Design a protein around this nucleic acid. Structure first.
Length: 266
DNA sequence: CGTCCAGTCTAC
DNA sequence: TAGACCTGGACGG
């Protein structure tokens, strides 16, 4: 997932879990190299928030719950294929790598972090990743200022299409988003980032870093629901669209665009 | 059957 | 940085 997917995932967890009580342990799959979640309570609620490309689950025991302990926070990064599902306890999907089980009684459900490729990671501790910039979705003015106020930084030496993936400044922006954002302003992807952003001292390039992902959020769903996917493929104008160019950036990631590749092309 | 394609993280 | 980390779907034979 990118910003939209992480945000929609957070809304999914909060709606799904609003009226559920969890109890017992936090089960990890045998295959997962992420840490055991050292947490057990007779009764806890789960809530989520997203910030950029990270999602924070908070495990909050009910007053009286045993053992007495304080809330525990986990941050997830999804990598290529992470997601959350609320499933029947005895019908876990494949690659359900972390599972929270609803308490005795009630219909026995499991909230599962599902990650086919296992590129996703989780950390004990609620801290956002130090060095990630503010969320392009929920912290727009802070994100905007964090870029224009630090254009001297060497990150802006790189092609704009590469800078847009630097989560220190574009926390939430990933591959389809950079293609879709640049196509809307017909900016060559290998224009120098500083050159494009100097200008901004018309929805402009930093506004699109906010408004474009917000469009994806308003599409809704996307595993949070199959025509959900069709609605997305329809929304796309550039990424993987017939008649568009593609190149490799210097980290081997495919940028989609129309026309002028731009000066710093390989 | 095979090939090729789809975001960190970390060792050097 | 260059390579590591994984599965599954879309292809072509």
């Amino acid at each position: 997932g990118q910003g939209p997917e992480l945000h929609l995932a957070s809304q999914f967890v909060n709606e799904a879990c609003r009226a559920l009580v969890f109890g017992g342990c936090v089960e990890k799959s045998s295959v997962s190299r992420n840490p055991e979640v050292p947490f057990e309570s007779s009764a806890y609620r789960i809530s989520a928030s997203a910030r950029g490309k990270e999602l924070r689950l908070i495990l909050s025991p009910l007053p009286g719950a045993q053992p007495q302990q304080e809330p525990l926070a986990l941050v997830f990064r999804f990598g290529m294929s992470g997601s959350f599902q609320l499933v029947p306890r005895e019908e876990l999907p494949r690659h359900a790598h972390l599972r929270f089980y609803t308490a005795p009684p009630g219909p026995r459900l499991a909230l599962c972090f599902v990650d086919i490729r296992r590129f996703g990671r989780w950390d004990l501790g609620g801290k956002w990743q130090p060095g990630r910039g503010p969320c392009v979705l929920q912290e727009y003015q802070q994100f905007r200022e964090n870029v224009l106020r630090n254009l001297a930084d060497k990150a802006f030496d790189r092609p704009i299409c590469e800078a847009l993936l630097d989560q220190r400044f574009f926390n939430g922006i990933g591959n389809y988003l950079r293609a879709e954002i640049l196509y809307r302003l017909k900016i060559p992807p290998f224009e120098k980032a500083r050159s494009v952003l100097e200008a901004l001292q018309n929805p402009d390039l930093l506004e699109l870093c906010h408004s474009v992902p917000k469009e994806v959020v308003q599409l809704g769903g996307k595993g949070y629901g199959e025509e959900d996917f069709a609605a997305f493929r329809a929304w796309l104008r550039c990424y993987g669209m017939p008649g568009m160019s593609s190149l490799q950036d210097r980290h081997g990631r495919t940028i989609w665009f129309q026309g002028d590749p731009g000066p710093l092309a390989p």
